[PDB]
Ligand SMILES: O=S1(=O)CCN2C=CC=C(c3ccc(Oc4ccccc4)cc3)C2=N1
């Protein structure tokens with residue numbers, strides 16, 4: 001019937017530009033876990049689609065004053081895209097305005113350090129001042145810290161919100177670059193999936209420390225009232241049960257390992 | 261306003277009879293993770309409820325001949341209960357007939373051995389014959405093997421379906437007892453949640469070995485068209501985000517664990 005507009009985000013190893021992308025067109029420009037997942041979901045649900053990178057480069061949050069959503073969430077809410085296929089965290093505030101499939105991947109918030117940084121846990125970060133730490137802007141990790149009542153995480157947020165210079169970053173790449181360049185004086189709070197990927201990539205100078213802070217999932221999101229909602233949900237379950245999601249995780253994490 | 265009928269299952273530590281249950285009435289007869297969760301779901305959704313134990317003691321499968329659903333799934337499908345609050349696995353075949361909330365707990369199929377059994381993986385089990393292995397006789401783990409399109413799990417199914425005497429058990433308790441009494445000659449395939457619980461119980465003679473074979477979740481289930489669906493889903497998200505689900509897992513698994 002109609003070509004489905006898929007909103008997604010450039011985030012390794014979910015969606016990446018191929019090495020030779022400038023000689024390619026349309027969906028062929030991109031590779032990654034979510035590029036493969038989009039192809040599979042489309043096949044099972046019987047639609048044609050166009051991958052479009054989210055304009056503002058954000059996941060999505062609601063401005064507290066204007067109540068306007070940005071990011072991939074806003075693209076669905078305001079009718080700019082038909083579906084989001086991305087590492088988009090299922091959250092309460094989002095589920096109030098968009099629908100999510102059952103989760104296709106598990107994750108938790110985690111800590112990234114430069115190798116040798118004397119930090120082993122969230123408690124460790126909160127007890128010192130020499131090592132700065134932050135999160136991604138406009139995402140679910142930031143919101144976790146803003147909202148937490150757990151003593152350690154409340155203390156961390158109190159520090160983060162007013163720290164100078166700013167500890168928050170615009171992209172994961174910016175957070176990772178900051179860790180790598182700061183000689184051990186910056187630690188980054190990010191999802192375990194992204195942390196684990198980066199740990200197995202050159203220059204192999206980062207690591208995940210401590211347990212995950214929470215347990216949650218990424219889901220495929222559709223605007224409320226979407227005719228795709230049921231089919232997409234069942235397709236996610238079908239792909240998990242046929243072992244394809246596990247295969248894709250091995251393809252884009254384990255097989256892409258550069259650190260041994 | 262009507263009292264909501266909750267179907268659940270006697271499975272430790274999700275729902276158990278209190279030691280003084282004969283002297284107690286209604287919901288007060290029961291304790292466990294799902295008893296605590298039901299109380300919270302009901303409070304956040306604004307309903308009164310009655311806990312009922314599934315008549316046939318089963319989770320839910322569709323008979324190949326009659327096409328009749330049994331267990332908790334059957335109780336929802338046939339209108340005998342309004343909601344299931346239990347360790348009920350989200351699956352494609354079930355999602356076609358009932359609705360699940362987002363998961364409240366993560367799990368995968370796992371291997372329970374008697375300590376010192378020379379088994380480390382599902383691969384190991386599939387390559388040998390001295391050590392028998394089986395599953396719960398009417399649940400999602402059995403169906404995982406039966407419907408698998410994965411060669412290694414098809415091999416395991418081909419063995420299990422034809423093993424004599426039967427490798428299948430009626431309850432988790434029966435599976436655990438079989439492991440404990442078989443001197444390392446029976447391994448039990450069960451969900452990681454139950455495996456982890458038993459590992460922390462006297463006489464501390466079992467353990468979980470290897471990685472999980474899959475990744476999925478338990479969900480709170482409602483019959484299609486239920487007016488409870490949205491509120492239940494948002495309640496699960498709220499309770500995960502506020503840290504309650506983690507607290508309840510700690511309470512019932514580890515806090516009073518019997519194996520140090
Ligand atoms: O709905 S499923 O059965 C659909 C397929 N499946 C696949 C991969 C991963 C999951 C998962 C992700 C996140 C998840 O989140 C949690 C964790 C712990 C407490 C509450 C929520 C729980 C299961 C998953 N679930």
Ligand SMILES: N[C@@H](CCC(=O)O)C(=O)O
Pocket residue numbers: 059060087088089090136138139140141142189190191
């Ligand atoms: N997956 C997150 C983005 C990453 C993060 O916040 O750490 C989201 O959906 O907002």
Ligand SMILES: N[C@@H](CCC(=O)O)C(=O)O
Pocket residue numbers: 319320347348349396398399400401402449450451
């Ligand atoms: N949680 C399973 C029961 C246990 C199992 O099959 O291992 C179900 O919902 O069917």
Ligand SMILES: [Zn+2]
Pocket residue numbers: 040043044244
């Ligand atoms: Zn497929």
Ligand SMILES: [Zn+2]
Pocket residue numbers: 044045238
């Ligand atoms: Zn299909």
